[PDB]
Amino acid sequence: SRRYDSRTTIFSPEGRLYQVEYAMEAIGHAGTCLGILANDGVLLAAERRNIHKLLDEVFFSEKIYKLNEDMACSVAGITSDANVLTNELRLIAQRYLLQYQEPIPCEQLVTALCDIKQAYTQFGGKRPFGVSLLYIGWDKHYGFQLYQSDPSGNYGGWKATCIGNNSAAAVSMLKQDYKEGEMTLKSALALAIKVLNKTMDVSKLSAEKVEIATLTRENGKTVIRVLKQKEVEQLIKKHEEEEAKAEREK
Amino acid sequence: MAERGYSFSLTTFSPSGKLVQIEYALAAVAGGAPSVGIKAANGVVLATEKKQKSILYDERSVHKVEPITKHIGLVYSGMGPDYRVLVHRARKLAQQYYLVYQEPIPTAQLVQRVASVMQEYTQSGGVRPFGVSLLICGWNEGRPYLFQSDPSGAYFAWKATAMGKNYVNGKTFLEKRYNEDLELEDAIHTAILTLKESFEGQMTEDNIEVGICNEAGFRRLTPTEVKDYLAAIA
Amino acid sequence: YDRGVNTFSPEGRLFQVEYAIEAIKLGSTAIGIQTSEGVCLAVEKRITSPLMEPSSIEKIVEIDAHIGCAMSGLIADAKTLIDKARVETQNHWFTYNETMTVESVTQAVSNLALQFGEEDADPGAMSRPFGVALLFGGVDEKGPQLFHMDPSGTFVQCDARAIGSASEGAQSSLQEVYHKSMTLKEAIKSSLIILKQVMEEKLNATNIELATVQPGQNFHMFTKEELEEVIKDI
Amino acid sequence: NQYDNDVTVWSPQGRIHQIEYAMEAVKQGSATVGLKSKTHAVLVALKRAQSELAAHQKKILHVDNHIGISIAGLTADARLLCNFMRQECLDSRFVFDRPLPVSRLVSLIGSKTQIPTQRYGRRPYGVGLLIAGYDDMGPHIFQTCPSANYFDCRAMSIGARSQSARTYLERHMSEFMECNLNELVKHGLRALRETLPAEQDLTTKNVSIGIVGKDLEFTIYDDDDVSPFLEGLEERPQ
Amino acid sequence: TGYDLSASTFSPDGRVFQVEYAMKAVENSSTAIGIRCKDGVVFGVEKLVLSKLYEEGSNKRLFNVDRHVGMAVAGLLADARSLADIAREEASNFRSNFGYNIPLKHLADRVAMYVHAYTLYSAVRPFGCSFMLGSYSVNDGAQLYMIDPSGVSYGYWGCAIGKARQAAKTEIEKLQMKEMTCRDIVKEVAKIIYIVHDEVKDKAFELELSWVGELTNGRHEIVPKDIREEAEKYAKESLK
Amino acid sequence: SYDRAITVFSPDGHLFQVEYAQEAVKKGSTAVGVRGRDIVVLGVEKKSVAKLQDERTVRKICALDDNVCMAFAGLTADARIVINRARVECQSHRLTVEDPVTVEYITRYIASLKQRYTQSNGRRPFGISALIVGFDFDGTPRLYQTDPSGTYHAWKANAIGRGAKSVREFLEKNYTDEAIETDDLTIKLVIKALLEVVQSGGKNIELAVMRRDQSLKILNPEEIEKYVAEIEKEKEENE
Amino acid sequence: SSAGFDRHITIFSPEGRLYQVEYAFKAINQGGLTSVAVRGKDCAVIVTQKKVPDKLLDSSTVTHLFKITENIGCVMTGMTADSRSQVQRARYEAANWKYKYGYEIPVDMLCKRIADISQVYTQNAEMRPLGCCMILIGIDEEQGPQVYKCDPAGYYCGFKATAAGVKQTESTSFLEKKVKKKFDWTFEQTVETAITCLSTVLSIDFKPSEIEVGVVTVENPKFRILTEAEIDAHLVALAE
Amino acid sequence: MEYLIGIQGPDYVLVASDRVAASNIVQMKDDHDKMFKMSEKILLLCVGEAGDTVQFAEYIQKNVQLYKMRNGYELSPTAAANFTRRNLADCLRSRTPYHVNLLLAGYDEHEGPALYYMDYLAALAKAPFAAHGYGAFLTLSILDRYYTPTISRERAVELLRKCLEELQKRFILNLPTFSVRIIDKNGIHDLDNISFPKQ
């Protein structure tokens, strides 16, 4: 019946879509997800949340998912919506591989999910998918690429971006310290740790609290390795060493 | 005569951005009777407290701990009828995997598939979100796996967890113990103790229902075995 | 204030259909006159700016060689109605090898006017009554004929009619000017005098479109350039 | 107030408001009069003109050789019912090779009208009809309301100012069975004359007369054809 | 208020108000009474004539649902005609599927289940009619059932529906229905209706009477005009 | 599926939802289109480059077919669906009635889709108004504008987006008979309109011009800067 | 605690409570009736109060006890029409179980299937939750006699003895004390315990006609509805 | 009946198609083009049934062009061959089967020249030199005898001429003129039509 109905897709008198804006707020509450692009490789690092001692941690990184051999994504937002979208992304990549026997390029995957996300806003009187995800991938057509998809269905190709709780602060640090045309994944990894230390209120950036995954092309194979906690620990110490060196300068 | 019915989601994003109906369903899980799940290195132990209001009710007729498959079992906190609908659905999903792959469903896989059904209710129209949170347990590839699925459909893997009345106190009680070096499932005693901490008048073989999943499989402990464990419970 | 797409006034007609009648009032004025020597159809383009080409605005269209339509209110809605009329005349030709009378074409568009209903029904014509007031004019076996329709779906045959904004003012003058045997030439001149009075802007050739269908000739292409000669006459 | 919005909702007084509002649509409509005689049935109608230049809208629509329907309500609704009635008579002729009994058609018309007045979303049909027919039983006149209740009537009137017509038809109802076609139309046009405001008068342009009888297939006499029926009338008693 | 908008809503008290409002419409309807005699059932309906111009038989509230079954309707006439059509159809399906005339107990239950379905959903309004079905069979004997808008079907030795339901049943209880012969029962039905008519609250009414029984050979039929009229004469004489 | 009318007439006689959809176009970034004697030109503004962001992904000018090209102002997501739907129709038009797609036909198709969303139950109207610029077989350059409601009008020059009114007034006042001509002058007229755009960044404004006998070419940022320098030189001449 | 239409439709409320389902429980009590069931060592007995308000209603038609299958019987407490519909759904599900699986439905399964139908009514709006509670009695091999109750909310459990209707808190307590010291009741004792519990809670000391008793026994598996005379012999025995 | 030959060299693909369209005993068009340009560097030539060839070829061509408009990059020759194979394969078990024999020639910036052979059954095989038609049975031995992996573009046109001459010396079908095209880094180039009016 009309009385028990939520408009969901109806336009505001202002002209904005109210539900989509509300969904964006949910992404803001979710944990920090940050991506930095370097010429050698593209990396996605996200902050683990609700790290209670009893959790098994057997999911091989809850935030990070591998959509295809050459593509990966991390999502901030309602977990249930994320699981539905991550499965859909994997199917779209596979369906392309069968129709044309070549891996999906990247923007095509982002646009295809984005088309679904917009469709929910467009019609059906149904709740929008309140999830925002960053896509890191390599393609023959345009090399390493990074993309961000909003709940609205609009997408972007940012070389460096953050979609988590402290996104405004992370982007400001990224804009100032990202060196365009300078690669070195190691420099990008250090920048990521510094952004994470600012974004995370908890000090010391504990290795368990953060997850880091790096996509690099080796021997023409594209390897989405996930950094081990020991690798994360050495990186945090390196950030501390730089902070200590600044203290020595002071 | 109304056919399929309402096609508009009853759950919608708040101005804050948190779905209100899912939060209300969480309240039913907290309001539910206490359920405790502990995973020991040999096997998971699922314990829930069933206190029938009167002697008239036959406790044996209904089991809160149920076997989804030979190696997978479920315990619930929240509305009872909804748990039965999920339990039937989970058994169908587990059998469909077996038919396609000719191998018993991996424990994690059942949770994702059950969770996907739970998420469907939240997005889909007319249906209210489920009011039940489950603590699925399984023994695939030797290692025991304990997982919890919330009404929203988010699934988390827990070495130990508790849901229902005084869940927070239960979580702290488990935090004090749960060293997780218990090669044997002596955690059956600890699970009885955590339910006992929030238990009301007494703990009896009828009062507590316990199901254990080991290398052998998921077996609901016999009422006599629950009495033996309830007896000499420290 | 949900009301309904289909709902009745306490003592009266459907509210949405009444609101649709209001939408025509915010529309380009069109005057249609029927004479023994043919039907004269006139309209005000109301071009908003010099940059837009005047030709792109079309308020007169050819449904068939002997039929033309004057439109008002929302132009976008008329496009579906115009196409149906053109398909309807063409299907009458394929089946009968004869020309549809103007009245039959009016009924076919008129039938689609009330086909809106939220539950079930047909998606293509739906949501709301069409916001348009067509003025079909044509020469058929009976003779030159002009017909007026409204979103309510009530077709009528009118010797002279005015539609859109200032229709009431145009109609009052139309009654006085109309004569028992006006020649088509007298009507084309009489209509443009009325068109100039109602329109705020000058009666420039770009501002007004007049097209006539006569027993001898097919619907003429808006009297291009010859329009200036009639404008020169006034 | 809340109860008035839908047909599905029932008032605390147990009356369906939307049905009553649909009933009003018939009242805001041109008056029509139906009479019957032992052998013939006449359905005079008062056509109303939007403008002097505009032609009066046609009220009596032929359904089959034996049946004709007057309309007093939203025209588009009447067309949907009239299309159904033409189809129903055609199917009866096609399968049973006989004219559909008029009463049986009225029964089908009611069942179609009842389904919207019940189901959610769908709106009550809002047209009042005065069907006239000839069958083995004989001449018939049937009134249909938007409520879906048919009523078999020897005479009838529906629409604005119809009450005056009903009073005249009731006073002279006894005379109707034993009269020739001319008299039956003459009583019927006199009934329309009562519906007409006193200043206005019956003219060939404003009156449509339709007659079905033992030897007459439904004929919608109008314009000049109406003039002999109009002639011989006593002056209106104003 | 605010819990009476839909029939898919239970009041905090524990009732479906929309069904109750539908039953109110039945109360507004004029009385129709059915009595089970020793050999058959007789139904009489008080239908007041709103307009003299109606030719009689207009809005008839007694319907021959099946050869052996007949119904008397009180409520919105439009809703009733639809119900009779469901009943006529359900009877026809039984004769085609199982090969014999439907038992009245089954027909009342099957029609009642349909009436019940409307109450459960917001989409469809509850029915506004309370018809009574009566049948006579040599094998099963005379049976009378009344189905109300809620969907409740109860077998009644005597029953009434409408504004004068209480007055009619009280007059009906005095009659010895179990032993009275059907022809004798007809005069009694006419008397009960004439007493409960109200005289000035309603305008002049026409008495519609139906006979199903051994006299009618197990076929529901309208009472013959000769059997009627004399029944009207007794009713007018009895009231005065 | 959901079957209730999202847009219903209000008592004033206006479809309120369609007006709200137009408001979304008003909030959209400005887009300017002019037709040259032989070279059709269209331009976009408010690139709002964040340095980290990549420009190719955010481009708001696309070629539906070799003959036609489009620019959009309004909700970005809605446009991506409408553009891809037009691309399918243009290729589908070739499969049926074999031939290229006339610019007017593609604008009618985009308009009909937009009108259908207003006249459909359960679907919110598209929030994009579009400038479709293309050359027909005759070679006459054609530019058309599609409203969110679904009305198409041929325009020799027009602009849509934030501050559309100011640019539209500037375009009519600055419009030159002969369409400026010389190709560079027609591009300059858009560059002058781009200067009229509020940001007036220079590099921030990006424009693409179709020869109308070849294929759409995006102006190189350095090439656009040289055209901006030509406008700056004209400003120096005015001084 | 109220949020939006939480109390107007079957949607969750603050505190995770389905108000509409709680209103449905009140509906069972709305009908002025009570029913009690007792499970003995060798037999299971169901008793109900039959109230015929007017003599005209046929006593046989007014029954709240129905036969789901030859070996399974039920007592319905709640709105009559809704209860009659649940009876048909249960009868159909048992027929399907026999056809599809080849053995008669276990009484435990019939309850779960009817309960599963009820839970969906709560889950999906557009369907009212239902206002009837059903108690099922049957003999199952290796389970002895069994009594089961299905709530409108869809809860199901096995019951040694139970009651539903207007006065059930009193009935459960009176039975609970008797259950504590029952020491396995015999068939006469089970009928006596049920009749006495109803007699005391209603405080009516009802005669045989006023109540209906249906019993299922290990010796006679077929569900049997006791005739009034058979009820009287048990009724006098408790009276002594 | 209709003849298609493809010879592939180090940096080029040479494709020749017959130009005869015949209904019954009469030959009705002698200028028929059996080559459809799916994209700038990919050409599909199809020989099969009277209406199946145009409908299948155009659908593949339009879809390949559409991918370029939306994506902005032309499909690689290989992907287009796999896409065509899937559509023919899906239709094989369908109410309307497509009886079309197709060979696809393309040049890719990285892969280089590619020639793909597809049967009506939709089996796709990449081949160095390939032929279709009854004519293929005589010509393919000549291609096998003279083909060398490294072959100049000029030598290929001569080899195409040698095989085309055998289609007049030892074949029952008139097959008078053959259309010749080459695909290379620049794009498809229409070499002069090889003709046998007697020259």
Author numbering:
A (entry chain i): 2 to 251
B (entry chain h): 1 to 234
C (entry chain k): 8 to 241
D (entry chain l): 4 to 241
E (entry chain m), G (entry chain g): 5 to 244
F (entry chain j): 2 to 240
H (entry chain q): 1 to 199
What does the literature reporting this entry say, word for word?
One activator is the ATP-dependent 19S complex that recognizes and unfolds ubiquitinated substrates for degradation in an ATP-dependent manner. Affinity purification of human endogenous 20S(β4-StrepII) pulls down multiple proteasomal complexes, including 20S, singly capped with 19S, PA200, and PA28. The purified proteasomal complexes were first visualized by negative-stain EM, followed by cryo-EM structure determination of singly capped proteasomal complexes of PA28–20S, PA200–20S, and 19S–20S at ∼2.6 to ∼3.2 Å resolution, with and without MG-132 inhibitor. The conformations that we captured here, although all singly capped, are generally consistent with the conformations reported previously. To visualize what might happen if proteolysis was blocked, we purified proteasome complexes via 20S(β4-StrepII) by StrepII pull-down in the presence of the peptide-like inhibitor MG-132 and carried out cryo-EM analysis. Besides the 20S proteolytic chamber, additional density is also observed in both antechambers, indicating that MG-132 can diffuse into all inner chambers of the 20S proteasome. Inhibition of proteolysis by MG-132 does not inhibit diffusion of peptide-like molecules within the proteasome, indicating that proteolysis is likely decoupled from substrate movement in the proteasome.
The proteasome plays an essential role in protein degradation and is critical to maintaining cellular protein homeostasis. The mammalian proteasome core particle, 20S, is a large, barrel-shaped protein complex composed of four stacked heptameric rings, including two inner β-rings flanked by two outer α-rings that are each formed by seven different α or β subunits. There are three types of known endogenous proteasomal activators that bind the 20S to open the α-ring gates.
